[model samples]
Target: DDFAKLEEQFDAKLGIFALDTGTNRTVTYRPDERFAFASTIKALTVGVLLQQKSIEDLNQRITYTRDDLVNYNPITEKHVDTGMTLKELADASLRYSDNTAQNLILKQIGGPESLKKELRKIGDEVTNPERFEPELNEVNPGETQDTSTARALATSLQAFALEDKLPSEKRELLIDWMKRNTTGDALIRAGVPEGWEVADKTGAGSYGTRNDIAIIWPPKGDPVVLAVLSSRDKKDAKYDDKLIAEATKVVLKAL
Candidate 1:
């Protein structure tokens, strides 16, 4: 009921799924619908790498030339010649949503398909990524490329963030990066109460696609895992940060 109103108000389709990890309570509205994964897939990309390598492996440096740069690469573009360690790349990808950093990590981990494999290992069958950054954001209607269902991503977050899918240190590091993420100030974080900790990743793509998947800790309860994904019908529609925030507000109230 709440989500349907928001979808109509925003003139967009919405898919939401949230879970209270402690009680196993869930909230769902169109949870199975596909939405573009966009930059949000970087979290899983980094997760796969964390699973396959050791902490010491993160120190290995990777160098790239100017030709390797891509759009929206604030961090990697700066240190092109000097190169960056795997740790730095992962941090930049998660915290800054650096496109070049994400691509580099994807390449190191064996490309976009690797994330899909990781999702499968975690028991998420609906999330898929078929292309690299920038390209994946195309988001053509009815196409399944680079997309995921709200339920699949929220469940994946529970496994990667709360469960022992990854080692303790690695999972902790990933959550820390998400907590410090600079791109999601106006999304789920804005809707939550003051001082409640939120670790999230935000994504923006064509067709006004906006997404945020998170693990939110209240002042006195167990954390909640939430995914809010939305998209409009028009190709050139503008992304609405407020819609995502308002949807978060609704989900919190329901919980």
Candidate 2:
């Protein structure tokens, strides 16, 4: 399949899963292999909180100090003294991949293990979040920390984004943040045809790990849920945006 060719061409491993909601068609390659979830988990984190908390509850303000800050946290760092609402933090986590914002939300939701339990409750068995920001980005081989299979991640995306697992308002709010995501311009968003609406979250981690999980809506057809996770063997290998874009291109054609 073209996925194998893309893997060979890029000198990386790839796990992909795509579901066409209208026709129930699927395209997959290495869909069950574990890959570092990186910032992609932020979307799911916000999703679980949405399921457990009301919008008004989320509007409650939360305060954090400098000790709460972590690397790659532009939004939270800026608002350190001012603090922010739970809803704002969640939006920043999804839209900007803000590390501190994500951890704060995780804190409110009872951390990584609690998120894992919520995932199990929703019938997703292959996703695990074992650490907080930065540490979880290690992506070490043979370690299960903060890793997920493509199928599992895609299925969870389908549930939270497409299915009614979350209340309608909450789901819409989540999708709105995803649609405004700032990190996916060169990944899945680069591959789809013009005018297609894509709500996606992008991730990057150690060992060249790069990921994008998305719900794409074409102009005249059904929406498709897709997850693409890629990693290189070398610890210092650079992320390849085109590799993910090409995979998205190939997967869209296959569907």
Candidate 3:
């Protein structure tokens, strides 16, 4: 009943999957339509590096320029140093939704093209008809991208949570990296019971395109994957978040 109401209110198609401790459902309006990823692409890029590559290699130095500062990514006050290590950049990008950090991180991780390759290999492809290609330089202006559904995001979070003991330190480092998320928003955190560890990443851009990919890691249990996307008015904070808040309660109760 609540789920149906949410679909009606936001005019958003919701897709959810509970690896554990949540509910799994999907309600779509234009299920095949694709928009820009906005900032959600940050998490995907992080997973590619931390899961496939070495976080040990994460200690490299990244330079930041004026353009990098105002890129599509958001920057956190905590990440004010001139040059940053991969760990710091990832933390700032994922935890605080820092655009500069995310921009640099995306470059280091091989940009959207490489990310697509990683997605293909991991089998987490979704119907993203659009892909943003921002030239770190001046030649390429930039394009925006989006996906038809939040399916791949949830599955990616599930994999991030499930890969506690990967064959490579890269995966473990990535999980550890995700666990360090610092952004404080409603959605998952609002619904999660006290003492629960909710690690996730949120992206907001282009008016109403707001979304989050969350992992609810119980003190001792399988983690659940949650994702929420919206294309509504600018003032839909409480109104839109209400949907996620309600969805969170429903999923946790169902779990």
Candidate 4:
């Protein structure tokens, strides 16, 4: 109830879902409303590519130029005149949430349609992302470009955490990558109790949208998979990590 109330504090729609792996118990509010995906869907991009190529291909090189420059990028700051391996690009995308590196990977994978198809094939029908390239400046205009539901996101995480999809090694590698993600430390992870673990991705974009999806590993219990999505106010809203942290605290307390 507090979590629901906490969500009400925002002038945004907070699509939330949390599932307890041990009991198959679930907590949810607004689980099906679509929200802008932001960079969180980069996980799906990486997953689709992994399905098409081996980890060895992760080391394949892609050159960078001024053309790759885009919004929210630290990649161009360092690698502008050079090239980076696919693995390094993925690290930059997930670890730092690099838009340039994300677009590069999308380019290599032949774009978001493939990711849409891959996700749809797995029964995640709502996560349809159109592009990651900022060169086009297509950041949802008055309409959403790529969208997802909290339930859809949490379900995918449920599958990943249970090792019900992807090879175990690949699954762990992706989880390990997400665990190293540094962008959302102030969101879900910020509220997690010490000694527990949370691997997650954060997505932020034009319309005050801030979203996070996580697989949480408590030291004494089964992992919890959760997703929180929001869209309120207008573009460039201030960071709302405190809200997410508070929601996480409530979720854990209720457990």
Q: Per-residue lDDT for 206 in model 1?
A: 94
**Superposition error at 255 for model 4 (Å):** 2.1
The most accurate candidate by lDDT is 2
lDDT tens readout by residue for model 2, 173-222: 99999999988999999999998999999999999999999999999899
Residue 143 of model 3 has an lDDT of 33
* Best-fitting candidate, scored by TM-score: 2
Scored by CA lDDT, what does every candidate get? Answer: 0.91, 0.93, 0.60, 0.77
Better of 1 and 2 by TM-score: 2
User: RMSD, each candidate, Å?
Assistant: 0.9, 0.7, 5.1, 2.3
TM-score of 3: 0.76
Ranking by lDDT: 2, 1, 4, 3
Q: What TM-score does structure 4 among the candidates reach?
A: 0.91
Estimate TM-scores for all models.
0.98, 0.98, 0.76, 0.91
Instruction: Name model 2 segments beyond 4 Å from true.
Output: none
Predicted candidate 1 versus true structure: per-residue lDDT over 138-230, tens digit per residue: 988999989999998888888888889988999999999999999999999999989799999999999999999999999999999999999
- In candidate 3, which residue ranges exceed 4 Å CA deviation? 10-13, 21-36, 71-81, 127-144, 164-168, 233-239
